[PDB]
Design a protein around this ligand. Structure first.
Ligand SMILES: O=C(O)C[C@@H]1CC[C@H](NC(=O)Cc2cccs2)B(O)O1
Ligand SMILES: [Li+]
Ligand code: NA
Ligand code: NA
Length: 259
């Protein structure tokens, strides 16, 4: 009751639903609020998309430097990086950086095609032990965030657990893990979310998502505090059936409550 209460109040003022899961990888302590409920992934799937690309780079030499030629037909709104390199194309690594750090939509669709679609990414997440994640559609359709629709959703706990496995754990080898960590560390889209909740001399890598309904948005992150083990956490919202401030505030409560 007591730990739930500040989250329940934040949710009440916000008007919709919030879900939080945070793990201290040193002590094993956790903070949980609606952590097993489903929320739309929105663009936050693009982080796991990059990790799946990296997994394939353990088995296919040269994958990351492979150029992908694409034309104008592959572009969709919010593709700031892939619209600039239309003449030269981009490599798999370049598309992955663009998808993680700018949430580039065309880059995300191109990488999904490479992995065999939403079904292929979902299969990768199953292979690391995530039985909750599901991606069903492409950009932009996956952003619809229809209340009660399980398509293109996961839970805060499953997101955090998979993020931990892929950045700190055993689901990727060190060179791939370090590349994923570096892409998350350089993200440009998260400066009002979990990053707004952390002390300044701590380091953060994160991936955001923002869906097609105001009030449906999210962020997950690995946080490296000074002098203690990393923290992994995820904060997701669903519009009532503003968002950035709520995500930051929930992240603050998590870091403050966490053992
Ligand atoms: O990383 C996110 O926080 C931003 C990212 C943008 C692409 C995807 N969103 C859409 O295309 C609609 C949009 C909302 C806000 C800007 S564009 B996504 O779900 O989220
Ligand atoms: Li600072
Ligand atoms: Na965890
Ligand atoms: Na790993």
């Amino acid at each position: 009751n007591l730990v739930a209460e500040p989250f329940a109040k934040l949710e009440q003022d916000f008007g919709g639903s919030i879900g939080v899961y945070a793990m201290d990888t040193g002590s094993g302590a956790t903070v949980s609020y609606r952590a097993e409920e489903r929320f739309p992934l929105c663009s936050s799937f693009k982080g796991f998309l990059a990790a799946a690309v990296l997994a394939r780079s353990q088995q296919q030499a040269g994958l990351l430097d492979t150029p992908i030629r694409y034309g104008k037909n592959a572009l969709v709104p919010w593709s700031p990086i892939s619209e600039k390199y239309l003449t030269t194309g981009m490599t798999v690594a370049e598309l992955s950086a663009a998808a993680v750090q700018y949430s580039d939509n065309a880059a995300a669709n191109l990488l999904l095609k490479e992995l065999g679609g939403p079904a292929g990414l979902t299969a990768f997440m199953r292979s690391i032990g995530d039985t909750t994640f599901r991606l069903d559609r492409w950009e932009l359709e996956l952003n619809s965030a229809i209340p009660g629709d399980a398509r293109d959703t996961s839970s805060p706990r499953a997101v955090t657990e998979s993020l931990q496995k892929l950045t700190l754990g055993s689901a990727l080898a060190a060179p791939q893990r370090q590349q994923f960590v570096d892409w998350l560390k350089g993200n440009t889209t998260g400066n009002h979310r979990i990053r707004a909740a952390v002390p300044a001399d701590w380091a953060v890598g994160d991936k955001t998502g923002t869906c097609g309904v105001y009030g449906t948005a999210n962020d997950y992150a690995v946080v490296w505090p000074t002098g203690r083990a990393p923290i992994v956490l995820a904060v997701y919202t669903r519009a009532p059936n503003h968002s950035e401030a709520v995500i930051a505030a929930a992240a603050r409560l998590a870091l403050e409550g966490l053992g």
